[PDB]
Amino acid sequence: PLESQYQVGPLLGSGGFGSVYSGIRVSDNLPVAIKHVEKDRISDWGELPNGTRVPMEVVLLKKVSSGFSGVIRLLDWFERPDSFVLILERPEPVQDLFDFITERGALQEELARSFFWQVLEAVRHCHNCGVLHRDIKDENILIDLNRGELKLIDFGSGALLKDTVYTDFDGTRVYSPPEWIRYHRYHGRSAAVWSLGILLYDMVCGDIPFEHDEEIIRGQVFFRQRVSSECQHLIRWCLALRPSDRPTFEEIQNHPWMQDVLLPQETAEIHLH
């Protein structure tokens, strides 16, 4: 019965993603996020199997919701005359990885390893579901502070996964691969692995490695913090200039630096509590 299934709390944030509100599902008191996007402001449109015109974001979110919990799940959506309203899961207490790094600086490698591992599992889930995120960065990762579990958010720059070339990109430039910069061409998986190398450097160094196009294209990685040789190796592998020189997800997860990861709860007990 209408939107009246939800009680609206404080605004959490607004930007290119729309305006996102804290809220509660009235029926079972479940914490939710309520995201409003103006129709006039949506660029990418898709279609539901049912045969309904929706934002591509809804299509992607629908394809990745299910048992696995590495992605923030879409629970419901509504169409208003001038906007779409999306009902998403809300961990509590929560902090996004960007704010976590801002507050705590470079992460100890054991913590970075646990977080990176969970991000890998989430991205693998997306790809298994036929979805490319295209905007993997610390701002799009939430930490369930109590369970030590990470969750991917914001599929508004996403696309269906395909094996052919992409020639369009609307994600974050400083996380985008040299092939995008030089040629306006990339393939989904190798571009994702590039963004994961930027994210891993970000975790262990406290900031992203590249600010300018020239630095991305040069691809030379300098460490500003003490970082193990194994971790540096993995980062530099993910950041190979030639897309085909980058590791697959299997290769990343089998890397020496990724061995003996902590469980989420263990991570929380050691690093978050």
Ligand SMILES: c1ccc(Nc2c[nH]c3ncccc23)cc1
């Ligand atoms: C696009 C889609 C969703 C979000 N935020 C959130 C979903 N769930 C949340 N829970 C806490 C804080 C923020 C969010 C941001 C951009």
